[PDB]
Each structure stands twice: as C-alpha cells, then as structure tokens.
Design a protein around this ligand. Structure first.
Ligand SMILES: C[S@@+](CC[C@H](N)C(=O)[O-])C[C@H]1O[C@@H](n2cnc3c(N)ncnc32)[C@H](O)[C@@H]1O
Ligand SMILES: Nc1ncnc2c1ncn2[C@@H]1O[C@H](CSCC[C@H](N)C(=O)O)[C@@H](O)[C@H]1O
Lengths: 347, 342
C-alpha cells in the first residue's frame, strides 16, 4: 500500500478527461494535422494557428502545460528537439479526433457529449440511484426531467443530438463492412427509427429496399423526406406496422425487460414468418476485460444509469432471453466490431 | 483509424472517476475491507451492510452496475459477480490507527467546485489574466470558500490527509532534521507541519510563520512558537527554514524575493528546505509524472499564477536568491526535499 503512487494513479482519473476536453474545445488535434502526416510541433506553434489566443502572451506555456498531460496519458505522442522545447504529435486513439477530409465525422461530437457538464452534473448524483427509491441522477441534479430540460435548453439539445449523430455515421460504416444479411430482404422497417437516417442510409447500399420509418408522431412530424423512406407515426408499445424484416438500433437498451417483451411481441405479430427483428446494441461481454467490448457496454450502461436508469445494456444470453419469451425460433447473434453486434431474432 | 477502439479508450476517461467517486461516496471500499483480509464480497451483500440504502429494492442491481466499471477499470477485483479490494482499492479504507486514507484527498481533486472550474480550462489559454475558478464561480476562491463551508471543509480534509501521507514519506527517508536545533516553517499554516517534526526530533525549537489572520487561529503546540507577518516583507531569523507547498504557488519573480528574505534571515551553514513534487524532465505513464501534473493542472484552474517545477528550475530560483548549494533529495514518486545551502 504505497499511497504516493495510489495518488498519481487515482489522482489523474479526473484530470486526463477534462484536459482532453480542453484540447478538443481549442481544436488542437485539428490544428496539429494542418501541419502534415507523422508531424510534431510546439504548443508555441499551435497557439499561433489559434484565433482567440491573439493578445494572450501566456497562451503558449498554458497550452504546453495541458498537452504535457495528454502527451503523458498516451492521448498524444511527444518529443523534444535542440534552448529545449516540447514538440507534439498524433496517435491511433488521437487521429480519431481529426475531422475527416470528406464528411467531417470524428469522435469530437461523441466525446463532448460524454464529458458534457450536463452529464457530469448528472454523474455527481449516481450515489442516489442506489440510496433513494426511483431517483434519477439527471432529475436530482437538474430542475426536472430530461425532455423538460432539453426542451427549454437549446445547447444541451445540440450536444445530445450531434453526438448520437456522428456516433451513428461511425456505428453504421462498420455495420456495412461486416454484416451483409440485408439482401435476402426487400422490405425493412425501423421501429423507434428516429427520423429515418438509419434506413435513409441502408436503402442506398441496397437500393432494392422498401425503406419504412416508424417513430412517434412529434419525431416524424419534424422528419425530412429521404427518397427510399416512407415515414409512419405511432406508439410501437401499442402496435408496430407490418413489414418483412424490422430494425431496432438503440431502442431495447432504453427500456425495461417487460417493456422489451411487449414491444418484441407487437414486432413479431407484424412480421412475416421468414423475416427477423434485427437488434443493433453494444453487447455486454460475460467476463469484463480492459477489453474495449467491455467499455463500449459499460460506458452507456453508466450514461443510462445517470440519464434514464430504467435503461440497461445486456449480455447475449440476456438478449435471446428476450427474443425467445416473445416467440422467436432462432436468436442468431453476429459479432461486428469491439462489442457491436447484430443479434437477429427469427420468427 | 479504428473509431470503435478509441471510442472506449476515451469514453472511459470520464466514467472511472465519477464511478469511483460514487463508490467512495457510498463506502464500498471499506465495507469490502470490513469482511476480513483478501476477501471477495458480492453486490447484494455489500448493499446488505449499507444503511442509507436499506429501503431500495433495486439497490444491489444498480451497485453491481458501478462496481463492474471499477472491476474493468482494475480499481477492484472481478472474481466471478464477487468483488474484492486491491493495491489501488486498499488506499481508500480509513486506517485503524488514524482513520486516514487517500479518500478525503480524491473526493477533493474531483469535487464539483473543482471540476466546474476545470470545465473553463480553455479560458486560461484564451483570455489573459483569466481564472477558471472565477469564470466558473461568482467570486475569487477565498471569497467563495469564505461563504460556502462544505467546499472549504472538503479542501481542508483533502490537504490534511495528503500532508500526513507526504510526511510519513519524508520522515522515513530524510536524515537532515537530526542535527537541527531550530526550524522555521515559512508559510507554516497553523503549524501542524512544524509540530509533527518537533514531536519526532524534540531538541529542535519549532517556529510557525504565517499570515496574521491564519496564525490568529493556530492551536498551541509543544516546541512550536507562532510568529505572524508577511514573508514577502521580512521572514524571522532561524538556523534553518522549511518551505512546504509554498514556491509552487508563485511566479519566479515573487519566489526569489521569498528566497532573498529567507537567506537574509539565515546564518552561514543555514539551509532552506523546499518540499514539493518535482516535475520530471521526461514525462511518462508513471507516478513521478502524474504526482506533478495533477497539481500543475489544479493550479491552472484554481491559481494560474502558480506552477510545478523541475529540479533545475528550483535550483535556478536558489542561485538567484544567492544560495551557494542545491541538494536535490528524492523521497517517493516525485516527492523531493530540496536544500538551498547559505
Ligand atoms: C435512441 S433513439 C434510436 C436512434 C436511431 N435508431 C438511430 O440509430 O439514429 C430511440 C427512439 O425511440 C423512439 N421512441 C420512443 N418511444 C417510442 C414509441 N412509443 N413509439 C415509437 N418510437 C418511440 C424515439 O422517438 C427515438 O427516436
Ligand atoms: N505573505 C505571506 N506571509 C506568510 N504566509 C503566507 C503569505 N502568503 C501565503 N502564506 C501562507 O502560505 C500557506 C500556503 S500553502 C500551505 C502551507 C503548509 N506547507 C502546509 O502544508 O500546511 C497559507 O497558509 C498562507 O497563509
């Protein structure tokens, strides 16, 4: 029990992420690549390619103090050239924050959500979800309910959307590459489909696809016109349209076990025998490593527990436990990437 | 570019510490200790012995969910879920002897007031003379602390515990005090520092030197003698001086004045004792790097005037004050005792 290591070892748990979130906020990773592939610059250099830092002499040293920490975290590479300066360079998990040449996707939007003040405020009240009966960290921490806050609070809406959005562009691109069980299907229906996007994209790698979008009236009300897509409003708990194969990306984790039955029922009772409710979650591995498949589950099981804790991420066991108790012959799960599955529930 | 690799590496960065805070806030780490050496207690059982949660049907359902993350984190031991303490975890259990642990100090480092300031870190790179704490909170840190008690206690409990641990280290490794008859603790605080030392080396006469307003409240200690004043104008006379967590609070300019005054109130063969965490010349995923980075950040957020420093930089302050010798004395994971000899 060496306290003065257990310090620097637990003391950094809070620092690393808020140092990171400042690099992002200051668009460091971008400005670094606007210098070349496998490159290396001083904070002095990066504080020059920064607009709001004109007329703050300390800009360069203060920045060097942040980057040193990321550079020590591995979240950045670092090297010193001959009067000796610290020069900075990108990494694997650090290029994943350079916005792409074409479409602009990055984890920036995803990571600014996770590390967002609204969220952390909500984390700071986790304690409660154990202690109090039904308490919601989010609710305990803020005026009232999440949809209430988010209505009356534009920038919280921006960040929760922009995150789940870039993170979809990425969660999907690798649904493509692996899974190809989209072509012995002509018709597909997105239950809790959002405003299409999911299908919009699908019915464009598979143009021979009857793209249907099912969500709440107020959602589809806003929802734009994708060629491929026909939209449908309802309450998937009361009844789901008819369709061949159906799609449930990030619906089942928002919902309890009983409410996951009642949905999957209505999903079957409107599926032709031969079609399948496709389920796209991050799956909770049964033994939990430092394994990314283990953090890709745990991270959201937390965010759920903080903002909507009636939610839950599940083991592949726990998902066929559902597929079955609805009434589904198969339950044939396809590993995709680092914990992202397509559990298939067959009727 | 594996988007769903780095999605976990970075995603967890903010989940561990808030998750850990929740475990501390709920007692977990101790309660797993209160089941005998190298135990392995369970989510349901730990809830079992947790009074403030004795009427939450879902309690253990929710707890297991946090612990998992800690398990994966490696702060706890999987054992399949049957959780149990570790090297890391053990440092979170209030001791038999004094009830001390790292808790008080982490519960501090990760307190809302501090994170809230952290959220404005960008501002110290953008606006000149800007103070994250200040951007974030109404007032300046002292005004704020003056009027919010629970923040001000958390900063106390935090620093308190931390010193204890740092002193246990310094005492176990540093001879220096043995042939000392007088010790002046410049910036001494309430003299809890110089008292602990005089207790361990009683042929040393303790003098505690701080701001009047501080001294005005210090308790009475055997062989400690309180002296109020303003170390920037003059420091009292003493055979030797102690400077603990003082230099790292101030610009180079202000430091060498504090050091010129120390020299002027020293004999010849008198020495100043800098106790700081030294910032390595090469940073790395090691305790000696993070033990200097954590403060250097906390500084930027709560005191941009201050900075951690490198054995060479401290030395440069020494010479500029006019000391003739610097002896750097490594203690533990970056902790030094620096001697400036006059
Ligand atoms: C996490 S989002 C799904 C995101 C979307 N699949 C994507 O990948 O972009 C959950 C969706 O469930 C929808 N939803 C919630 N309750 C519903 C209900 N009763 N009927 C239909 N849709 C519902 C919401 O409107 C929301 O769009
Ligand atoms: N001009 C000045 N004169 C004397 N003491 C001062 C001062 N400016 C700051 N201080 C004192 O320096 C201390 C800062 S740091 C904490 C001191 C001590 N090493 C400890 O571990 O307990 C404060 O208590 C503060 O009042």
């Amino acid at each position: 029990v060496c306290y003065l290591s257990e310090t620097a070892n637990l003391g950094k748990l809070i620092c690393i992420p808020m140092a990171l979130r400042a690099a992002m906020e200051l668009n460091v990773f971008q400005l670094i690549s606007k210098f070349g592939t496998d490159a290396k610059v001083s904070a002095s250099e990066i504080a020059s390619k920064m607009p709001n830092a004109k007329n703050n002499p300390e800009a360069a040293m203060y920045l060097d103090r942040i980057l040193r920490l990321l550079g020590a975290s591995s979240i950045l590479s670092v090297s010193t050239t001959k009067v000796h300066e610290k020069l900075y360079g990108l990494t694997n998990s650090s290029c994943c924050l350079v916005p792409r040449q074409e479409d602009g996707v990055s984890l920036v939007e995803e990571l600014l959500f996770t590390s967002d003040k609204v969220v952390v405020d909500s984390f700071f009240k986790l304690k409660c979800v154990v202690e109090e009966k039904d308490s919601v960290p989010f609710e305990v921490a803020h005026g009232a309910k999440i949809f209430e806050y988010a209505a009356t609070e534009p920038r919280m809406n921006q960040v929760f959307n922009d995150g789940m959005a870039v993170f979809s562009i990425v969660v999907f691109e690798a649904v493509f590459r692996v899974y190809d069980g989209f072509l012995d299907m002509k018709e597909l229906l997105d239950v809790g489909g959002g405003i299409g996007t999911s299908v919009s994209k699908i019915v464009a790698k598979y143009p021979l696809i009857r793209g249907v979008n099912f969500d709440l009236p107020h959602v589809i009300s806003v929802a734009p016109q994708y060629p491929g897509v026909e939209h449908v409003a309802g309450d998937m708990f009361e009844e789901v349209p008819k369709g061949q194969n159906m799609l449930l990306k990030w619906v089942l984790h928002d919902w309890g076990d009983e409410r996951c039955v009642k949905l999957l029922k209505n999903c079957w009772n409107s599926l032709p025998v031969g079609g399948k409710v496709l389920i796209i979650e991050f799956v909770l591995p049964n033994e939990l490593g430092n394994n990314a498949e283990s953090f890709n589950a745990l991270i959201p099981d937390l965010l759920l527990m903080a903002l909507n804790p009636g939610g839950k991420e599940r083991t592949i066991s726990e998902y066929d436990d559902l597929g079955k108790a609805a009434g589904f012959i198969k339950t044939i799960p396809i590993p995709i990437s680092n914990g992202l599955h397509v559990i298939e529930f067959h009727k």
